């Protein structure tokens, strides 16, 4: 539960497990379309790990 | 104890036979410009259709004077420019980087997990 | 004010071409206390080599160590005639003197050293371009004559001959006597172990002055590879590369306040061929590092180091690990950063590599 | 991570066949040397394994003291393509310095 | 252009160079201050208005050094104050250049005592270094970060003292006056003091630097400071438009600015400059002396937003150039460490994590895909808006993206939220992505590219113009060439910035055009501010006023010349130029010998492709932005009266 909430505030912090490219993409997504687009990114990737 | 020598250190402050592999040359000519103007051992040989790579580099060993300007420049992109040492060993570069066994260090908990 | 800092300034001025002749200028200081239980400890060293005969390989090497330690003007002079015979054998005629306070005595030796590696495998030397660890053994056969001019000399001669003729473990405890203080703790820290000596003879004969005691003994320095006297046997005697006189004038003054070291030398063997046309500042001897690590781990220090390699004009450094901070078109300078970390590494006992591959 | 180790132009570390001599009559005189030029090696079975695996790339220069033509296994049905053994393949670098001015 | 390379210079040389440049800059500041003296302290009329002083007049009047008061009285006082501060800058710059010379020459011997201090070991300012540092940074930039933070803390403290006492602005918390800048000057002291202490006791580590890194640390800090400049530009735009800054930036509009090169009172041809000069001819406007620079009201000129735009775009251009240069110099360092083999030996994320070529390819592919998507979206929006407003293919403005305002959650950033702001944001993202393609190519593909590792080629010289026509062409593949392409690509994002801040309607190319529905945007989109004309018609509207100025017209012609001169070197012409220059040499030789017996023995020089690209990008950027200066210096010319529907 910590990872998903940290993600909703800090998505790239959530994808930190993923590769550096994914982390940079999630950071850019925070920069552009903050929260909705990047929250979408984090939920996709984290649910995929599941 | 007190008797000593003395000293003051003001630290505190208080042969070569360079060749070109015609197989790998791309005819850039970055080595030609380094050749001395009168020597001009390195020359261009054209097969055809320059864009298809016909142009290539050749060192006329008779003209070469073993000055090392071509090879020491580190200018050959293809590695064709080689040096055969007096005992004999082909050098594609002045110094190749050491070979390494590499792996992506991804930490476990803090920095780059997994 | 209570900050321990190790300031230093090293300089290597090389000579172009096949000449490996290099000039080493090293200044250093550090406010850390020394490890000498007797302080202050001041010493000067003069080491001059003159090629006596290029054909026979004989080189006359004169070493003068002067020192004052708790007010004891010690002075050891020695002039030897080192000469290769094979790739694994050297002969050394020589004379010398040692003077402590008022006491003093001379000696004259006819030694022979045979450095035999434990293996000469072609695979190792054809696969490893830079063979550092080469295990081996080094048999010294020393015949030394001392004029017995003092009462102490004769007393020591009597005591030693009595010990040899009466004690059955002299050949084994002589190492305990001989590696005074921490020296025995140093041979184990460098991979060295000295075998029991073989005292082939103790005699006394009339000489130019009086009774001269002649001792013929043998021992064997055993190196596991980390010993520079074995792996670098040919590398440490560049008589072939010696064309002119070489000098090394060093010194260190070490009081409780701190240590100050000054060295100025010019001698061959500084640059050795590494293959591929790349000359290399020679592999660092490991015995100095692993022996000075027995003293350099005793205080945390801030490194302020600067290495100035003045290449001959036309040469360029292709590899530098750590890399050179600056370059005045020939004077590559290492200062701070990974070089400081490496200086801390080797000031504390590290044997890490510092590759400097320069070529024209 | 593989392009930055060794020369970046050779994915497989390259080994020129510099010296070979017929006098020893065993052809063990074949002395492979990497393009780095620090290891005068020999064609051992481990080198054979590396060559077949593609880790290394043995090559031959044209301008040299001749290595061994038809004395070190050679295929001449086409233009010569020297082989240490039929399964091996020593690709000859061609070097046209004499034919051209 | 490489004489002062980082390698050629050591840390003390850099200290001295920066110090001497600070002194030179202080001299420049004194020059600008004196240029700002409208009335001399002796009574006579003073210098006209320069952009160099109209850029700093808001700040100077904020500090009370200058005054917006218009009587000769107290303007004489402002001139005297400016002269005093310029003299202070002059003397302090002299001292700074002296220190810079000493550090550059390494002769750090006190002229009084003669003691030669050591850059490696030196107590700072005397006892303060002992209290705080306990001894200097023995080596290392990491151990220098804390000391520099303490130095900046002392700078902040000194500015607090100066503004409290010298300029009379006491520290008061309220952030609506210069007084807070005193307050915060003390705050940021403690912060940059305390942090410094921390970074002195607990140094930071990025081992890539610290070792042989004047170029590496320079690159990182130049990229950082470029982003600092971009942030400063955004902050300047926002704040200078806030009411709290109106007393210093909005009151420009109330003043009349006599600027050099502006329209001058013209005179008839039959004019004699004797006495009253009336009998001979008639001057253009009477009551002003002949050839005098006529007044220009700041209300029409919009000098508030003109100065704001000049400052903001100065910082934005400098920051983008600094980001590009930092990536370029970092690429040079990357290539050096790749050639010498240290690349694989670096043990930090800033180098290791992108060590794999797969991750580099994926990063650049993501950047390229995002760039394609955003550029295609914005360009489709803009061209469709143009198709609609021009009523092409039977369209009309009703089909344009007038509905596509920024979402209500993002309209706070924009005063009048319209499609213009949407296109601005997305164009900025797209231009950033475009330039990032080249920046990432520099960062990763500095020594080898996936094509080139497949093609068996390596990038060594970091400036090689090419490797030839092999593989169909290898033009412009060095990191220097990628830097040039990055600059030429960021030209467009920077333009978008200029056109946004100068009031243009960048959502369509033909806003305000007298054709079809181009003038209907204000009605259909319900805009409050009447944006300056669109991307193509903005040229025309702004040139209405550029052409009215002889000085701006001269700049127009000169920048245009400079721009088109760039093609002679950027185009694939170097070989043609070399052949032609050989012909030129032979022509000069034989023509001179026939015309004059003296022989020549001189050749016309032709730039190499590397130097050709360098000069071509310099000229391209120079012309483009010397003309953007005209766009930003004509006047804001964006009124708050929307245009009614065309019908
Ligand atoms: C130090 C590690 C080894 C050692 C390794 C070597 C090596 C290696 C050599 C000898 C050699 C000699 N050894 Mg021994 N030997 C050791 C212990 C001893 C002891 C003893 C009581 O400890 C004795 C009596 C001897 C006896 C001797 C002599 C018979 C002989 C000539 C010495 C001479 O040149 O000295 C003159 C005195 C000096 C040179 C004083 C300074 C000594 C230091 C170690 C030299 C440093 C060089 C410096 C880094 C470079 C300076 C450049 C200058 C221009 C020279 N060895 C220990 C066990 N021995 C040499 C030989 O082969 O003889 C035939 C020889 O090459
Ligand atoms: C078994 C592990 C080691 C090894 C361990 C030892 C040891 C231990 C000693 C020798 C000894 C010797 N070995 Mg060995 N030896 C090795 C491989 C070799 C190789 C080689 C082809 O590389 C060579 C040329 C030699 C040859 C030799 C001589 C240098 C020496 C002969 C002493 C004698 O009188 O007879 N060995 C292998 C790799 N060898 C002796 C010697 O004199 O040491 C100095 C000795 O005591
Ligand atoms: C009897 C002793 C041996 C001998 C033993 C050793 C040993 C052992 C080593 C060397 C090393 C070196 N020796 Mg020697 N060396 C001998 C004779 C010579 C002669 C000669 C022709 O006479 C020459 C020119 C040299 C030259 C050299 C260099 C090639 C090399 C150091 C390179 C470096 O950059 O140094 C830089 C030099 C400095 C930093 C200055 C050092 C100054 C001090 C004063 C010298 C060391 C003193 C030591 C700590 C104390 C000795 C006390 C003893 C108890 C008497 N040696 C004699 C015959 N030599 C070393 C090397 O690198 O091997 C590869 C090494 O390991
Ligand atoms: C143009 C795009 C990039 C850029 C691209 C390059 C390129 C490309 C190169 C450098 C090079 C260098 N750059 Mg840069 N670099 C940029 C920004 C910067 C900034 C900065 C403003 O923060 C700095 C400090 C540096 C620093 C440096 C040095 C590390 C290095 C050597 C410069 C010097 O000695 O040149 C000597 C010449 C200079 C002093 C600059 C020229 C200006 C003249 C001398 C100024 C005074 C006269 C007058 C006012 C203006 C000129 C025109 C007149 C008609 C005469 N760059 C810009 C934004 N940089 C070179 C180097 O060697 O890299 C390793 C190199 O090849
Ligand atoms: C604001 C903080 C900026 C910065 C701003 C500048 C600027 C601006 C300049 C430098 C200059 C230099 N910088 Mg810097 N610098 C920063 C951080 C660094 C760091 C570091 C972090 O440790 C390093 C190692 C360097 C390295 C260097 C040297 C290459 C050079 C100083 C040597 C000297 O003056 O030569 C002796 C040379 C002279 C004194 C002659 C100078 C000639 C004229 C007056 C200036 C030439 C360049 C050009 C006209 C300035 C253009 C600015 C543009 C308007 C954007 N910079 C950051 C990123 N630095 C100067 C340089 O030489 O640039 C090429 C320079 O002008
Ligand atoms: C504007 C003046 C210039 C300058 C010009 C000079 C001059 C001139 C001299 C030195 C000397 C020295 N400089 Mg300085 N130097 C500058 C900045 C630096 C910086 C830095 C903080 O980045 C460094 C590393 C140094 C390094 C050094 C030392 C090696 C040496 C002093 C030894 C010490 O114990 O002195 C203790 C004090 C110092 C460390 C000085 C620190 C710098 C201060 C700010 C100089 C101010 C001079 C000014 C006229 C007086 C104004 C004081 C007010 C309180 C503001 N300078 C300043 C910014 N430098 C001096 C010398 O050799 O001393 C023996 C000397 O005479
Ligand atoms: C972030 C703070 C600083 C920064 C600090 C540093 C430092 C420190 C170093 C570099 C270095 C480099 N920098 Mg940088 N740099 C920044 C901005 C940039 C930008 C840019 C336009 O934004 C670019 C293109 C570059 C480009 C480069 C290269 C020249 C070089 C790395 C080469 C390499 O192999 O990387 C390999 C590829 C990567 C490591 C990719 C992954 C990125 C890393 C892990 C961190 C950022 C991503 C972060 C986790 C994203 C998610 C969260 C968000 C923060 C919200 N920098 C900003 C201004 N840069 C190094 C160099 O050698 O300097 C000379 C170096 O030492
Ligand atoms: C003002 C703009 C230009 C010129 C001025 C000019 C001059 C010129 N050029 Mg050019 N050029 C372009 C612009 C200009 N090219 C563009 C935009 C392209 C992109 C396609 C381009 C391309 C090529 C190729 C491919 C080749 C050349 C040459 C070649 C010449 C050598 C001899 C010759 O042609 O003399 C005939 C040309 C003249 C002597 C021109 C007369 C001077 C003038 C009235 C005034 C000069 C104004 C000055 C430039 C402003 C500032 C100066 C000062 C204040 C700092 C030569 C003097 C080549 C040769 O060497 O072969 C002949 C060749 O091969 N080009
Ligand atoms: C993160 C998303 C990226 C988009 C950035 C937002 C741009 C919109 C913007 O201007 O903000 C909108 C704000 C205010 O937006 C309003 O816009 C109006 C025009 O219609 C006027 O400018 C008003 O003053 C202003 O309030 O404008 C600014 O802050 C302008 C300052 C410069 C901002 C752009 C700098 C970007 C530099 C990158 C250059 C790329 C080079 C390659
Ligand atoms: C900012 C950039 C800094 C400087 C770069 C700026 C710079 O280098 O310019 C760019 C470019 C110079 O590049 P080139 O290498 O081709 O110059 C060769 C010259 O010698 C002209 O042939 O200039 C042009 O070609 C256009 C202007 C040339 C006009 C000059 C005319 C020269 C006359 C020569 C005699 C002609 C008579 C013919 C006799 C037969
Ligand atoms: S056109 Fe010019 S830049 Fe391009 S490959 Fe050919 S020579 Fe190089
Ligand atoms: Ca305008």
mmCIF file of C-alpha atoms in Angstrom, chain E residues 90-314:
data_model
loop_
_atom_site.group_PDB
_atom_site.id
_atom_site.type_symbol
_atom_site.label_atom_id
_atom_site.label_comp_id
_atom_site.label_asym_id
_atom_site.label_seq_id
_atom_site.Cartn_x
_atom_site.Cartn_y
_atom_site.Cartn_z
ATOM 1 C CA UNK E 90 35.155 50.022 -11.221
ATOM 2 C CA UNK E 91 37.513 49.903 -8.243
ATOM 3 C CA UNK E 92 36.265 46.531 -7.007
ATOM 4 C CA UNK E 93 36.651 45.164 -10.527
ATOM 5 C CA UNK E 94 40.201 46.488 -10.626
ATOM 6 C CA UNK E 95 40.915 44.581 -7.412
ATOM 7 C CA UNK E 96 39.180 41.485 -8.789
ATOM 8 C CA UNK E 97 41.273 41.603 -11.965
ATOM 9 C CA UNK E 98 44.411 42.013 -9.851
ATOM 10 C CA UNK E 99 43.473 38.901 -7.900
ATOM 11 C CA UNK E 100 42.666 37.133 -11.148
ATOM 12 C CA UNK E 101 46.070 37.976 -12.583
ATOM 13 C CA UNK E 102 47.736 36.721 -9.410
ATOM 14 C CA UNK E 103 45.793 33.451 -9.478
ATOM 15 C CA UNK E 104 46.324 32.953 -13.218
ATOM 16 C CA UNK E 105 50.064 33.566 -12.806
ATOM 17 C CA UNK E 106 50.056 31.656 -9.475
ATOM 18 C CA UNK E 107 52.035 34.518 -7.875
ATOM 19 C CA UNK E 108 49.954 34.572 -4.692
ATOM 20 C CA UNK E 109 52.552 36.578 -2.777
ATOM 21 C CA UNK E 110 51.285 39.314 -0.492
ATOM 22 C CA UNK E 111 52.649 42.648 -1.795
ATOM 23 C CA UNK E 112 53.249 43.727 1.823
ATOM 24 C CA UNK E 113 54.645 40.658 3.606
ATOM 25 C CA UNK E 114 55.645 38.564 0.589
ATOM 26 C CA UNK E 115 54.327 35.324 2.082
ATOM 27 C CA UNK E 116 53.311 33.076 -0.815
ATOM 28 C CA UNK E 117 50.047 31.392 0.068
ATOM 29 C CA UNK E 118 49.154 28.000 -1.350
ATOM 30 C CA UNK E 119 45.996 27.345 -3.340
ATOM 31 C CA UNK E 120 46.102 23.824 -1.904
ATOM 32 C CA UNK E 121 46.524 24.983 1.717
ATOM 33 C CA UNK E 122 45.175 28.350 2.858
ATOM 34 C CA UNK E 123 43.272 29.589 5.888
ATOM 35 C CA UNK E 124 40.198 31.433 4.633
ATOM 36 C CA UNK E 125 40.097 35.129 5.582
ATOM 37 C CA UNK E 126 42.273 34.364 8.609
ATOM 38 C CA UNK E 127 40.646 33.091 11.792
ATOM 39 C CA UNK E 128 37.215 32.489 10.243
ATOM 40 C CA UNK E 129 38.592 29.553 8.274
ATOM 41 C CA UNK E 130 39.927 28.107 11.520
ATOM 42 C CA UNK E 131 36.582 28.559 13.278
ATOM 43 C CA UNK E 132 34.555 27.053 10.432
ATOM 44 C CA UNK E 133 36.787 25.148 8.013
ATOM 45 C CA UNK E 134 39.508 24.202 10.550
ATOM 46 C CA UNK E 135 41.824 24.113 7.528
ATOM 47 C CA UNK E 136 41.047 24.429 3.853
ATOM 48 C CA UNK E 137 39.952 21.929 1.238
ATOM 49 C CA UNK E 138 43.185 19.957 1.015
ATOM 50 C CA UNK E 139 42.025 19.014 -2.490
ATOM 51 C CA UNK E 140 38.784 18.002 -4.193
ATOM 52 C CA UNK E 141 35.811 19.989 -5.460
ATOM 53 C CA UNK E 142 33.569 17.934 -3.166
ATOM 54 C CA UNK E 143 35.352 19.412 -0.152
ATOM 55 C CA UNK E 144 35.032 22.772 -1.916
ATOM 56 C CA UNK E 145 31.237 22.703 -2.186
ATOM 57 C CA UNK E 146 30.764 23.463 1.502
ATOM 58 C CA UNK E 147 33.310 26.270 1.477
ATOM 59 C CA UNK E 148 31.633 27.752 -1.597
ATOM 60 C CA UNK E 149 28.278 27.514 0.163
ATOM 61 C CA UNK E 150 29.803 29.420 3.078
ATOM 62 C CA UNK E 151 31.189 31.983 0.629
ATOM 63 C CA UNK E 152 27.738 32.417 -0.908
ATOM 64 C CA UNK E 153 26.293 32.690 2.601
ATOM 65 C CA UNK E 154 28.726 35.520 3.280
ATOM 66 C CA UNK E 155 27.734 37.093 -0.046
ATOM 67 C CA UNK E 156 24.061 36.899 0.945
ATOM 68 C CA UNK E 157 24.899 38.379 4.349
ATOM 69 C CA UNK E 158 26.892 41.190 2.770
ATOM 70 C CA UNK E 159 24.040 42.019 0.427
ATOM 71 C CA UNK E 160 21.715 42.119 3.413
ATOM 72 C CA UNK E 161 24.043 44.556 5.174
ATOM 73 C CA UNK E 162 24.487 46.675 2.042
ATOM 74 C CA UNK E 163 20.762 46.993 1.378
ATOM 75 C CA UNK E 164 19.994 47.567 5.067
ATOM 76 C CA UNK E 165 22.559 50.355 5.487
ATOM 77 C CA UNK E 166 23.935 51.612 2.169
ATOM 78 C CA UNK E 167 20.692 51.393 0.167
ATOM 79 C CA UNK E 168 18.378 51.809 3.163
ATOM 80 C CA UNK E 169 16.112 48.747 2.900
ATOM 81 C CA UNK E 170 15.713 47.210 6.343
ATOM 82 C CA UNK E 171 14.924 43.491 6.692
ATOM 83 C CA UNK E 172 11.131 43.160 6.840
ATOM 84 C CA UNK E 173 9.295 39.837 6.295
ATOM 85 C CA UNK E 174 6.625 41.162 3.918
ATOM 86 C CA UNK E 175 7.388 40.048 0.360
ATOM 87 C CA UNK E 176 5.730 43.036 -1.359
ATOM 88 C CA UNK E 177 8.801 45.285 -1.014
ATOM 89 C CA UNK E 178 12.559 45.178 -1.532
ATOM 90 C CA UNK E 179 12.740 44.890 2.260
ATOM 91 C CA UNK E 180 12.117 41.140 2.066
ATOM 92 C CA UNK E 181 15.111 40.808 -0.249
ATOM 93 C CA UNK E 182 17.089 41.998 2.767
ATOM 94 C CA UNK E 183 15.257 39.625 5.112
ATOM 95 C CA UNK E 184 15.770 36.683 2.772
ATOM 96 C CA UNK E 185 19.369 37.763 2.158
ATOM 97 C CA UNK E 186 19.937 36.885 5.800
ATOM 98 C CA UNK E 187 17.783 33.739 5.623
ATOM 99 C CA UNK E 188 19.647 32.325 2.635
ATOM 100 C CA UNK E 189 22.847 33.130 4.501
ATOM 101 C CA UNK E 190 22.105 30.731 7.357
ATOM 102 C CA UNK E 191 20.823 28.114 4.919
ATOM 103 C CA UNK E 192 23.810 28.385 2.606
ATOM 104 C CA UNK E 193 25.940 28.643 5.725
ATOM 105 C CA UNK E 194 24.498 25.621 7.521
ATOM 106 C CA UNK E 195 24.372 23.452 4.410
ATOM 107 C CA UNK E 196 27.942 24.500 3.711
ATOM 108 C CA UNK E 197 28.990 23.342 7.165
ATOM 109 C CA UNK E 198 27.199 20.070 6.488
ATOM 110 C CA UNK E 199 28.825 19.691 3.083
ATOM 111 C CA UNK E 200 32.125 20.587 4.724
ATOM 112 C CA UNK E 201 31.729 17.894 7.379
ATOM 113 C CA UNK E 202 29.841 15.396 5.179
ATOM 114 C CA UNK E 203 31.099 15.928 1.626
ATOM 115 C CA UNK E 204 29.037 14.729 -1.346
ATOM 116 C CA UNK E 205 30.237 12.174 -3.873
ATOM 117 C CA UNK E 206 29.814 11.862 -7.639
ATOM 118 C CA UNK E 207 33.062 10.126 -8.496
ATOM 119 C CA UNK E 208 32.781 10.842 -12.239
ATOM 120 C CA UNK E 209 33.925 14.335 -11.334
ATOM 121 C CA UNK E 210 36.523 15.247 -8.707
ATOM 122 C CA UNK E 211 39.241 13.395 -10.632
ATOM 123 C CA UNK E 212 39.931 14.995 -14.030
ATOM 124 C CA UNK E 213 36.737 16.920 -14.305
ATOM 125 C CA UNK E 214 37.156 20.636 -14.918
ATOM 126 C CA UNK E 215 35.337 19.810 -18.142
ATOM 127 C CA UNK E 216 33.023 17.276 -16.477
ATOM 128 C CA UNK E 217 32.137 19.454 -13.496
ATOM 129 C CA UNK E 218 31.945 22.424 -15.849
ATOM 130 C CA UNK E 219 29.492 20.544 -18.063
ATOM 131 C CA UNK E 220 27.264 19.468 -15.194
ATOM 132 C CA UNK E 221 27.256 22.914 -13.613
ATOM 133 C CA UNK E 222 26.687 24.612 -16.967
ATOM 134 C CA UNK E 223 23.646 22.442 -17.635
ATOM 135 C CA UNK E 224 22.478 23.128 -14.085
ATOM 136 C CA UNK E 225 23.009 26.869 -14.471
ATOM 137 C CA UNK E 226 21.247 26.804 -17.821
ATOM 138 C CA UNK E 227 18.208 25.359 -16.106
ATOM 139 C CA UNK E 228 18.753 27.990 -13.402
ATOM 140 C CA UNK E 229 18.632 30.628 -16.140
ATOM 141 C CA UNK E 230 15.448 29.146 -17.602
ATOM 142 C CA UNK E 231 13.839 29.118 -14.154
ATOM 143 C CA UNK E 232 15.012 32.689 -13.585
ATOM 144 C CA UNK E 233 13.460 33.704 -16.891
ATOM 145 C CA UNK E 234 10.132 32.138 -15.980
ATOM 146 C CA UNK E 235 10.268 33.700 -12.504
ATOM 147 C CA UNK E 236 11.157 37.076 -14.004
ATOM 148 C CA UNK E 237 8.251 36.894 -16.440
ATOM 149 C CA UNK E 238 5.783 35.948 -13.710
ATOM 150 C CA UNK E 239 7.030 38.327 -11.015
ATOM 151 C CA UNK E 240 7.805 41.402 -13.117
ATOM 152 C CA UNK E 241 4.171 41.188 -14.251
ATOM 153 C CA UNK E 242 2.940 40.949 -10.648
ATOM 154 C CA UNK E 243 1.630 44.093 -8.917
ATOM 155 C CA UNK E 244 4.478 44.137 -6.389
ATOM 156 C CA UNK E 245 6.922 44.774 -9.245
ATOM 157 C CA UNK E 246 4.664 47.328 -10.953
ATOM 158 C CA UNK E 247 6.329 50.287 -9.152
ATOM 159 C CA UNK E 248 9.569 49.259 -10.888
ATOM 160 C CA UNK E 249 8.472 47.650 -14.177
ATOM 161 C CA UNK E 250 4.945 48.891 -14.943
ATOM 162 C CA UNK E 251 5.887 52.523 -14.252
ATOM 163 C CA UNK E 252 8.203 52.337 -17.266
ATOM 164 C CA UNK E 253 5.106 52.860 -19.411
ATOM 165 C CA UNK E 254 4.501 56.236 -17.758
ATOM 166 C CA UNK E 255 7.979 57.437 -18.776
ATOM 167 C CA UNK E 256 9.069 58.631 -22.214
ATOM 168 C CA UNK E 257 12.227 56.968 -23.508
ATOM 169 C CA UNK E 258 14.653 58.724 -25.843
ATOM 170 C CA UNK E 259 16.524 55.717 -27.220
ATOM 171 C CA UNK E 260 19.504 55.872 -29.546
ATOM 172 C CA UNK E 261 18.576 55.123 -33.140
ATOM 173 C CA UNK E 262 14.873 55.854 -32.687
ATOM 174 C CA UNK E 263 13.205 58.300 -35.090
ATOM 175 C CA UNK E 264 15.168 61.548 -35.235
ATOM 176 C CA UNK E 265 13.664 64.945 -35.982
ATOM 177 C CA UNK E 266 14.180 65.117 -39.731
ATOM 178 C CA UNK E 267 15.251 68.200 -41.673
ATOM 179 C CA UNK E 268 14.541 69.363 -45.206
ATOM 180 C CA UNK E 269 17.334 69.176 -47.761
ATOM 181 C CA UNK E 270 17.541 72.990 -47.881
ATOM 182 C CA UNK E 271 18.542 73.155 -44.217
ATOM 183 C CA UNK E 272 21.437 75.135 -42.730
ATOM 184 C CA UNK E 273 22.466 74.520 -39.114
ATOM 185 C CA UNK E 274 23.177 78.129 -38.157
ATOM 186 C CA UNK E 275 21.561 79.945 -35.251
ATOM 187 C CA UNK E 276 17.832 79.314 -35.263
ATOM 188 C CA UNK E 277 18.205 77.433 -38.572
ATOM 189 C CA UNK E 278 14.563 78.217 -39.412
ATOM 190 C CA UNK E 279 15.170 80.491 -42.406
ATOM 191 C CA UNK E 280 17.050 77.905 -44.472
ATOM 192 C CA UNK E 281 14.531 75.104 -44.057
ATOM 193 C CA UNK E 282 11.935 73.429 -41.869
ATOM 194 C CA UNK E 283 12.608 70.622 -39.421
ATOM 195 C CA UNK E 284 10.135 67.747 -39.282
ATOM 196 C CA UNK E 285 8.648 68.451 -35.841
ATOM 197 C CA UNK E 286 9.167 71.898 -34.374
ATOM 198 C CA UNK E 287 9.933 72.505 -30.667
ATOM 199 C CA UNK E 288 12.697 69.854 -30.809
ATOM 200 C CA UNK E 289 16.237 70.672 -31.987
ATOM 201 C CA UNK E 290 17.110 69.352 -35.418
ATOM 202 C CA UNK E 291 18.375 65.752 -35.552
ATOM 203 C CA UNK E 292 17.248 65.253 -31.955
ATOM 204 C CA UNK E 293 15.945 61.821 -30.990
ATOM 205 C CA UNK E 294 12.200 62.278 -30.708
ATOM 206 C CA UNK E 295 10.381 61.134 -27.555
ATOM 207 C CA UNK E 296 8.770 57.703 -27.469
ATOM 208 C CA UNK E 297 6.056 57.063 -24.899
ATOM 209 C CA UNK E 298 6.344 53.859 -22.916
ATOM 210 C CA UNK E 299 2.570 53.406 -23.048
ATOM 211 C CA UNK E 300 2.561 52.803 -26.803
ATOM 212 C CA UNK E 301 5.951 51.086 -26.732
ATOM 213 C CA UNK E 302 4.878 48.933 -23.781
ATOM 214 C CA UNK E 303 8.301 49.309 -22.201
ATOM 215 C CA UNK E 304 7.205 47.355 -19.129
ATOM 216 C CA UNK E 305 6.690 44.158 -21.100
ATOM 217 C CA UNK E 306 9.513 45.064 -23.498
ATOM 218 C CA UNK E 307 12.054 45.112 -20.676
ATOM 219 C CA UNK E 308 10.436 42.075 -19.067
ATOM 220 C CA UNK E 309 10.627 40.216 -22.383
ATOM 221 C CA UNK E 310 14.238 41.247 -22.956
ATOM 222 C CA UNK E 311 15.325 40.037 -19.511
ATOM 223 C CA UNK E 312 13.260 36.855 -19.714
ATOM 224 C CA UNK E 313 14.462 35.961 -23.195
ATOM 225 C CA UNK E 314 18.042 36.813 -22.277
#
